[PDB]
């Protein structure tokens, strides 16, 4: 119980070893597994868990008919033991809402979940089993936050919300909370045209995030946040390796400060570990649909304009459906540098498989290795 501080570096990421996989749908065909979607995994100083927004019913249960819809009264944020299924006798409900984020600060944990009608949406920050503060919709058009863990330096945890339009401008704000209470907030500042759903990781006393420009960008907007002076900055990843889905095909040259054109109005949540030369990016392997997954070594892609991959490792085949990705790290593991971990939501059902009236998923997660481990597909 001492507020954790980001005291370390990223380690040399050369391979990726498995961390978790819950075989949820296959268990769920004969067990009281809940219908979820949008998952993430986060740790507290003695336990790591899987998280997801449930749709308040079991898969084989009749109320699963209609779970393609992703915002309603019945969704609850749930946590469940590492690599377990979200089972009705297991999952802990955290809060009631349809968008979230949780991070343990060092002393106790904070979780935010938004509920509401689309014109009257509300965020309540619970810190450590009780609610502490509420935020109401500043721009009355679906208040949303990230769906991955937040990161905390010294009691201060930066987290990002966006309320507005998806198809063109919205008001996103950075918020800093210490023990549930608000300390400040800021408008977005930078060249990043539009940001929403942000994968954040903390590394050497600052936190960095990749988000989604749903409006124009096929390259990813970036926000680098300084927690101590409570300041931030946005831009795009400079690469030709385009990572949003759908994208255009891979260009020879890229755009550092403006969004990359072609495909527009649409996008997926994703992560990156941009640590200079030690930079690995992830993307779908299919230009048009969430099918497949891969990790690629693209040294200096945040700054280098014509950055192309020097090493790779495939996680999911193009034949197998994937879904949202994002980053987490165990800040409490013993070491000199943090080990980069990540997850991929493996979606299953509607829209792509129209012969079931439900939509649910699995998860698979992976952390860095120093060795050049052999690749497999999951």
């Amino acid at each position, epitope marked *: 119980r001492e507020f954790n501080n980001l005291t370390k570096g990223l380690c040399t990421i050369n391979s990726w070893h498995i961390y978790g996989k819950d075989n949820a749908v296959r268990i769920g065909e004969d067990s009281d597994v809940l219908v979820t979607r949008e998952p993430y995994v986060s740790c507290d100083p003695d336990e790591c868990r899987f998280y997801a927004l449930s749709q308040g019913t079991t898969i084989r249960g009749k109320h699963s008919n209609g779970t393609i819809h992703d915002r309603s009264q019945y969704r609850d944020l749930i946590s469940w033991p590492l690599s377990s299924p979200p089972t009705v006798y297991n999952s802990r409900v955290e809060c009631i809402g349809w968008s979230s984020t949780s991070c343990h600060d060092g002393r106790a944990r904070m979780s935010i979940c938004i509920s509401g009608p689309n014109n009257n949406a509300s965020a309540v920050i619970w810190y450590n089993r009780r609610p502490v503060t509420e935020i109401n919709t500043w721009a009355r058009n679906i208040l949303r936050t990230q769906e991955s863990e937040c990161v905390c330096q010294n009691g201060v945890c930066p987290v990002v919300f966006t309320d507005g339009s998806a198809t063109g401008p919205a008001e996103t704000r950075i918020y800093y909370f210490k023990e549930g209470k608000i300390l400040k907030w800021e408008p977005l500042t930078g060249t990043a045209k539009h940001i929403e759903e942000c994968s954040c990781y903390g590394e050497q006393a600052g936190v960095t995030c990749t988000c989604r420009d749903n409006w124009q960008g096929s390259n990813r907007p970036v926000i680098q946040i300084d927690p101590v002076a409570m300041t931030h900055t946005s831009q795009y990843i400079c690469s030709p390796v385009l990572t949003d889905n759908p*994208r*255009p*095909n*891979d*260009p*020879t*040259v890229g755009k550092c400060n403006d969004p990359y*054109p*072609g*495909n527009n109005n649409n996008g997926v949540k994703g992560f990156s570990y941009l640590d200079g030369g030690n930079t690995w990016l992830g993307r779908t392997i*299919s*230009i*048009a*649909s969430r*099918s497949g997954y891969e990790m690629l070594k693209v040294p200096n892609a945040l700054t280098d304009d014509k950055s192309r991959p020097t090493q790779g490792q495939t996680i999911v085949l*193009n*034949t197998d459906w994937s879904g949202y990705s994002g980053s987490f790290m165990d800040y409490w593991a013993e070491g000199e540098c943090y080990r980069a971990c990540f997850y991929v939501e493996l979606i299953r059902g509607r829209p*792509k*498989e129209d012969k079931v009236w439900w939509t649910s998923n699995s998860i698979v997660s992976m952390c860095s290795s120093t060795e050049f481990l052999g690749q497999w597909n999951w």
Partner: antibody
Amino acid sequence: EVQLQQPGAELVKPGASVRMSCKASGYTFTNYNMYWVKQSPGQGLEWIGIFYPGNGDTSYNQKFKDKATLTADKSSNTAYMQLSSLTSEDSAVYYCARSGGSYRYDGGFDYWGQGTTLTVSS
Amino acid sequence: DIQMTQTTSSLSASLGDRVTISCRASQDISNYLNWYQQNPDGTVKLLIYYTSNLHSEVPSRFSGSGSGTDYSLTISNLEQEDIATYFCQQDFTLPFTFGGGTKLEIRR
């Protein structure tokens, strides 16, 4: 020996529904996206959609999304396409084609079908 | 759309000479352009993909080059049967858009 065999015509009536076929020959059907494209009597070529046969994904052109659904019967390596509510304005020729890319929407439509003529009549 | 353009649908040649055709894109399409020849009756073949690369069975004489927005095919030793309607198209992003086409006519 890439044969995308397609009939020379279909003669139809206004408003009904016809169903196209493109019999893929001499390659691995499960492994390449099939592409459907339209050529109306005095206009350039309009692509309608894609169908990847070994996973089942489909993607449609903005306007076409209403008129065409893409299908395939993998045992007979037949790609197919149902256009419903045909009329004068869609008396044209339709093609199937496959990309050089095996799942990639890249490298261009490398082998093309015969082209089947759609004539609506009373 | 992504505007694909081919200026005018006709050109002549007195059968023997080197001829050039040019496609314009509405945005910098990195270099994802391809060239298609429709035979006098039906049959469309592929000749060039990604601006310069020839397909499997091609005449040694067909060239392609360009950058950004404007991309040209050159046919050198115009052996008559090569007279038809050529089309450019892109696949930088989908929808795929094709040009209007240019028929070639001969004069001898």
